[PDB]
């Protein structure tokens, strides 16, 4: 599933994820693509924090394929 | 010539096109772009659409209030205080979006390349 992530620099990247991805895995994917260590990453979707210890499915964000959430780093 | 023009441009093979402006022609078919969100990088000319505003009835991808990007169709634009807004229809409903909330998928931008691509 396609998601977007807006970094602190203003750049927006894409990733592919599934509802089963852990937040830590999303952070590792951001590191892998953009070079930002997970320890610097604080993710949010629509103003709610996405926390370590959880999966994307826990936040009920990913619906069908046409909706591509924008996560923001803060 | 192209310097200072508003464009929509992508920086990866299969990437999305984002709004920005050309700040320099650096040769070898590359241009320095300042994207509207603040990101600056060199981008290939083949990946630049010299299209501003995006024309009526273009399929685009737009960031709604709810923080999802999804496809919609441009139905109008308006310029206010130097900022551009698009009226975009999604699932039959129009809303107003800032320019920087409107991007193009690879496929959506490829539809504009013959008319509006640089070069």
Numbering used by the authors:
A (entry chain B): 1 to 74
B (entry chain A): 1485 to 1603
What does the paper say about this structure?
In this study, we leverage this functional screening system to assess focused libraries targeting the protein-protein interface of i53, an engineered ubiquitin derivative, and its binding target, 53BP1. Using targeted saturation mutagenesis at the i53:53BP1 binding interface and a screening process in primary human HSPCs (a cell type with intact DNA repair, DNA damage sensing responses and other cell stress sensing signaling pathways), we identified i53 variants that introduce stabilizing interactions with 53BP1 and are more potent than i53 at increasing HDR editing outcomes in HSPCs. Using these classifications, we determined that the addition of i53 variants results in an increase of HDR by specifically reducing NHEJ events but not MMEJ nor other types of outcomes, consistent to their role as 53BP1 antagonists.
We first screened individual and combinatorial saturation mutagenesis libraries targeting two adjacent i53 residues L67 and H68, located at the binding interface of i53 and 53BP1, and identified amino acid variants that were enriched in the GFP+ population relative to i53, in particular variants that introduce a positive charge at residue 67. Crystal structures of i53 variants bound to 53BP1 Tudor domain. B Zoomed in view of the complex at the solvent-exposed loop preceding β5 for i53, L67H, and L67R. All recombinant variants complexed with the 53BP1 Tudor domain and exhibited increased binding affinity relative to parental i53, suggesting a correlation between the improved affinity of the selected variants and their enrichment in the GFP+ population in our screening platform.
